[PDB]
Amino acid sequence: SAGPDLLQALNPTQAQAADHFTGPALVIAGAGSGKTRTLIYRIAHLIGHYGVHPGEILAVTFTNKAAAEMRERAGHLVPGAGDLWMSTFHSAGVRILRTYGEHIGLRRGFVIYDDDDQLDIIKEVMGSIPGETQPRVIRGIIDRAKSNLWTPDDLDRSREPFISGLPRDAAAEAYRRYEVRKKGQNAIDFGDLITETVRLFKEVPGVLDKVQNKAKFIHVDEYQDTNRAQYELTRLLASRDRNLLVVGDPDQSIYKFRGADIQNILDFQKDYPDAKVYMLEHNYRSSARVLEAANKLIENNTERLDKTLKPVKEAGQPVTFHRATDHRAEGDYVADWLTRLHGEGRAWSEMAILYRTNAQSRVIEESLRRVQIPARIVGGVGFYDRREIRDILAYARLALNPADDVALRRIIGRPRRGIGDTALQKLMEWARTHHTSVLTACANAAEQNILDRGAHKATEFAGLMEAMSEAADNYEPAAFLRFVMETSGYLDLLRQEGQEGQVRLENLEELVSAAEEWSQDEANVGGSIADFLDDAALLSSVDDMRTKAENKGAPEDAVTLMTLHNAKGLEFPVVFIVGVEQGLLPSKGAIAEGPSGIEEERRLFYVGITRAMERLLMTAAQNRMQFGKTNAAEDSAFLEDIEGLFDTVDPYGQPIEY
Amino acid sequence: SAGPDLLQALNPTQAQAADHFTGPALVIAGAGSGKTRTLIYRIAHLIGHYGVHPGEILAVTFTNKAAAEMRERAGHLVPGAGDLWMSTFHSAGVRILRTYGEHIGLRRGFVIYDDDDQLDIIKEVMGSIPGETQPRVIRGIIDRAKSNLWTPDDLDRSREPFISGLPRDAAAEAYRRYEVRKKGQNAIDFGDLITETVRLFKEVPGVLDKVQNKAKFIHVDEYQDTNRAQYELTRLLASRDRNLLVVGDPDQSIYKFRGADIQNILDFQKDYPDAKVYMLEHNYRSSARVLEAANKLIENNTERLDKTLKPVKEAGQPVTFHRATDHRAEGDYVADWLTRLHGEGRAWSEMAILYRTNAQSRVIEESLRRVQIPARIVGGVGFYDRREIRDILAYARLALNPADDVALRRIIGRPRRGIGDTALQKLMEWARTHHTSVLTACANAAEQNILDRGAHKATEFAGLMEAMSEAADNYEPAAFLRFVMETSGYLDLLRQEGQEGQVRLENLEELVSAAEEWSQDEANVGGSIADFLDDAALLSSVDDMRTKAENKGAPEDAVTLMTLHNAKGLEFPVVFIVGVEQGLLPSKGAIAEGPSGIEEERRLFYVGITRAMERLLMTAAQNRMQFGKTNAAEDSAFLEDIEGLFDTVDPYGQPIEY
DNA sequence: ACGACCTGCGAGCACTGCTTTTTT
DNA sequence: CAGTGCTCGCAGGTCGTTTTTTT
Ligand SMILES: Nc1ncnc2c1ncn2[C@@H]1O[C@H](COP(=O)(O)OP(=O)(O)NP(=O)(O)O)[C@@H](O)[C@H]1O
Ligand SMILES: Nc1ncnc2c1ncn2[C@@H]1O[C@H](COP(=O)(O)OP(=O)(O)NP(=O)(O)O)[C@@H](O)[C@H]1O
Ligand SMILES: [Mg+2]
Ligand SMILES: [Mg+2]
Ligand code: NA
Ligand code: NA
């Protein structure tokens, strides 16, 4: 449509980035400087002005929510936004592998494991190894290796003779045996979503070429929190036409603990020596006051690229800090002030509370509840992570794929029905010699070489299952989930122990209703049940299917509660950062890691601060409760860093020193 | 109504007996001589001629069937038969005790034990005693003692130092402890029906006097097979007005094995020296031929009152014997011959088959079934004795009487439901210290001493029971038995194991239909369900509630199959006596007792023979199978006794001597 | 606080012997 | 046929570890 007018909506530098077009380009700019805004315009300009087809554009965001929100804002500038490919790296790996996984041994209908699934496999494999040792420790090494794009052999030659507390080679062994067992189940994990796609593109160059036709102009936001495997994925993708534009801010890199590699963004002009580089200097988000506090804070980190971050707004309402006697007084001080400011005109949805750890939510929730301030909890106890839901989702996995063993393992027991704690072991070894088909072991229980005591109990389960499978061979997702819930015998259990079980079956109802809202959605026209489970498996804390599911019964236009980490990318007129304490911000872990630990936490704190547009209120306590015990608390060292740049305050409005 | 005409319907001697009136009278006559006929006429004559009120007459028969049949025949002769009191001794014991048992500590709603109930009590009591030994051996000593009218102390002074194989004093102890336990349950047994009534009449002379107004003219049939307890009951009853007429034949005394005392009848005039004695000399039942065989047979017994038994009919068809190679050939020979005679004109219901033991019925049944000759089995597997029935009747006992422990014990685990085997025990001692009520223990399980690990299971049973008790507090027996069968969970068990279970639930349906037919009867107008259980408890082999229930689906006008014992009193134009073998008739038991054993068996055989009116066919085998093995068979010694008086015969018509 | 471990109870399934003398 | 013995399934209890952050 000739595009949106750049120089109308952007400053000249933003506008020249948005006008970039072909070849590698790197956009590097401090917080609140309009990196994401420039991205949105760039996408509309490629289409409007350079006549790029939407179905040739890929934009990779940190969360699907962030991608939905970009897409929409792009539709306001230019037609055809519906056709843009926009998602996380992991969501793209699903889409690529679902389409092309058969070129590298992934049979169609492969299953995507969750963390509980990974432990079934681990416990199963670790027995014979020189590895006491907790299955989850092993799981942590494997995830991290995959983020690093390491094979087991690679891990054998890794730097440290000890990983967590394990011998390097025992760890590699574990990983290696987990790998065989996981492939024997036609299954893959979260990190495989990235590593397998990379393997696909290297092994099958004609496949890379086909995908490059849809990913001809590549955009990647949050490039600072990219890992080696995502790095390598992006390289392969761009390798042909080299239309790669990345955007990020090294001061806001807060995922090293999980694999993020800040050198991806700092080496970009080395890896693409023909890149254009655009640097935004002006923050548009924040009051000049919160900004000065931000800049003086981040100047304490060392080895950082010094970049200009200059204010455009005036120095607004001053920044404040409050130390409460108690975390409970913190509670009340937050809860009280929400009102005052509401009373003065700011809507609930323009205010947020940020905390270092999810444990700190509980007290805050109750403090707003008491005063009935509506609350919206992001990233709390995940709804697709509850036992009830995964149990039903397991029944669903097993129905589509009768050869899925870890699914069986999880629900053969619940409800109880002649579960062979002894018997299952026997069906398990029986299956391996015959071949790993465990569900078939149950059907062949009465007829073949048998397990004596409860042969029939197996058969009945085999028949219960085929009825589900026949009900999945066609017959609708939301109602198929009713089929499973009813006939499995799951509901009548929860009703007969319906005390906390009513709480549990109340959630099972939501599942059907989610499966329903999803079915009746725009993008899911003719969507399979497999498709539903795919989406449910890939949700971020900030995604709709999660926030709605978990805040059901809450109004929108509520106060938002989340971690400092989930705040990445967002912005609010009013921000409360709570628990600014040595031991929390920075965490004890980061303290124990030395300067490089502290520097990560400082970035985290810097993110928190630069979330606020009009007012920032930080608080701390002198005492706080851990799991059952109360200990004295100290201010964060980070407050020392920004002394002189905020006012200390008592429960009421006014001045205190410190 | 002026009565029936005696001299029209009876010979002069019979008529003068039928005309007796006041004071003791003894009628003593051989088989087929019209003792029972005279009794029937005498009853009508007391009413018609002497103006005795029916409600003043008592006639004690050996079975309720025999009493129904007398009553009816009396109704043809005189109005007011409906009001006569006619029954067995044991049935009269129930009526007397139900009315007056509270005068001797029997609280209303006392329960009548069956043989399974007795064993519950036995096993419970014999633990501590110098008694290995089977609970049923003890049970047999107790029953015998009661028939003798012995107390435990009496048994301590009894003749033999060994009873069965027990020391005399351990047996008396057993009996003595059984007694306490049985009374602690407000319960009584079958023999108590006679001994407690006797105790009632001795302890409470005003009660005897009230009953004597209904039993003013007493009649007793089969007086030869009365035991001492019955002997003493009759004496008490007659002690005031002394209008006692007894009828019997010592040649047909066949119950010594159970207590019968032949001296009751032989001493009647020592006991009533002012008695009149009537003796019938003429048999009216039998062909002169079967009669000569009977007489020559009985003449072998010694020390018997030698009385005239002269024929009135002509020497009809000759009596025959057949030896068959097999019991199977016996089967076929009986089966084949039933038809011949059927073909010649005899109806099925004019023919019967008599065997020493109930085991012999199986082969016979099948032989008639093969040739589809309709069969009616008397005294086979008792219908009110099957497990399913006593289970439901136990539920019913418990509903009426929540304090019945034996009932509880039997069904607390039918169906299963936290049948605390260990819990029961813990439930049992709980109740002992607090007090007998075991059902309360189950209700008090959540509360109090806390029978744990399944507390609720007990409570739910206590609740299931109150619902039955509430449903027995009012409502209909036939539909209350539905209530029990449904809600107990009994039916859905038998349906879920409905294989031989369908055979078992088919029977449960008959129960409701019996319960119903009984309700809709003439005498049970406004009948309690307690009343129903009373009647079911007191059936003889020959009684309607039993034969109908056990031959359901069979036509009437069928061939009758029963033991020689159950033939007492009856008559048939055609009689087959099978298995006339040494070891059977006489039994090994009788053989081992010496001449007094042989003499009892000879009486038994004499009864069999004098059942036949027109034709008697006896058979024996050379081989026979017991339970597994097959052994050689030998003719009965009794055939030697009657040689010259029957024809030996081939499977066809005529002679094969031997 | 959370599951991953233990003690003990219920019950189903099999192994094993006189069932058969007669029954109010 | 029943009375008895062996082994298996499942609950109601106990204990130590929880989280640092999460695509
Ligand atoms: N040229 C501009 N004119 C007006 N508002 C702007 C301009 N550039 C950025 N903004 C606003 O500044 C705020 C932050 O922009 P955003 O594009 O979210 O910055 P970012 O660099 O992408 N923020 P962060 O991801 O947290 O480092 C938004 O509310 C934008 O609307
Ligand atoms: N005076 C009679 N006239 C005709 N038939 C008679 C006469 N007396 C007896 N009977 C018949 O003979 C058969 C036997 O009579 P019953 O009154 O049954 O004898 P009982 O002495 O009571 N028999 P039992 O009990 O087996 O020793 C019946 O069929 C009677 O009808
Ligand atoms: Mg941004
Ligand atoms: Mg008679
Ligand atoms: Na595209
Ligand atoms: Na009477």
Numbering used by the authors:
A (entry chain D), B (entry chain A): 4 to 134, 138 to 664
What are the paper's exact sentences on this?
UvrD is classified as a SF1A helicase and plays important functions in DNA replication, recombinational repair, methyl-directed mismatch repair and nucleotide excision repair. UvrD consists of two RecA-like domains (1A and 2A) that are responsible for nucleotide binding and hydrolysis and two additional domains (1B and 2B) that are involved in dsDNA binding. Here we present crystal structures of full-length and a C-terminally truncated construct of D. radiodurans UvrD (drUvrD) in complex with 3′-tailed dsDNA. Our structures obtained in apo- and AMPPNP bound states provide us with several snapshots of this essential cellular process and reveal a large-scale spiral movement of UvrD around the duplexed DNA.
Crystals containing the C-terminally truncated drUvrD∆C, an 18-mer DNA duplex with 7nt ssDNA extensions at its 3′-ends and AMPPNP diffracted to higher resolution. This complex produced two crystal forms (I and II) diffracting respectively to 2.5 and 3.0 Å resolution. Crystal form I appeared very rapidly (<1 day) and belonged to space group P212121 with two protein monomers and one DNA duplex per asymmetric unit, while crystal form II appeared after at least one week and belonged to space group P21 with four molecules of protein and two DNA duplexes per asymmetric unit. In both drUvrDFL and drUvrD∆C form I, the two drUvrD protomers are located on the same side of the DNA duplex and induce a bend in the DNA. In drUvrD∆C form I, four nucleotides (nt21-24) are tightly bound in the ssDNA-binding pocket. The terminal nucleotide (nt25) has already exited the helicase and is no longer visible in the electron density maps. Nucleotides 21 and 22 interact with Arg362 and Asn364 (motif IVa) and stack against Phe263 (motif III) that interferes with the regular stacking of the ssDNA bases and forces nucleotides 23 and 24 to adopt an orientation orthogonal to nucleotides 21 and 22. Nucleotide 24 is stabilized in this conformation by π-stacking of the base between Arg264 and Phe196 (motif Id) and of the deoxyribose ring against Phe65 (motif Ia). In form I, the third binding site involves Arg459 from the α19-α20 HLH motif, which interacts with the deoxyribose ring of nt13 (opposite strand) in the minor groove of the DNA duplex, while in form II, Phe633 from the β-hairpin motif stacks against the first base-pair (nt1=nt18) of the duplex. In drUvrD∆C form I and drUvrDFL, the nucleotides at the junction between the dsDNA and the ssDNA are poorly defined, indicating that this region is relatively flexible.
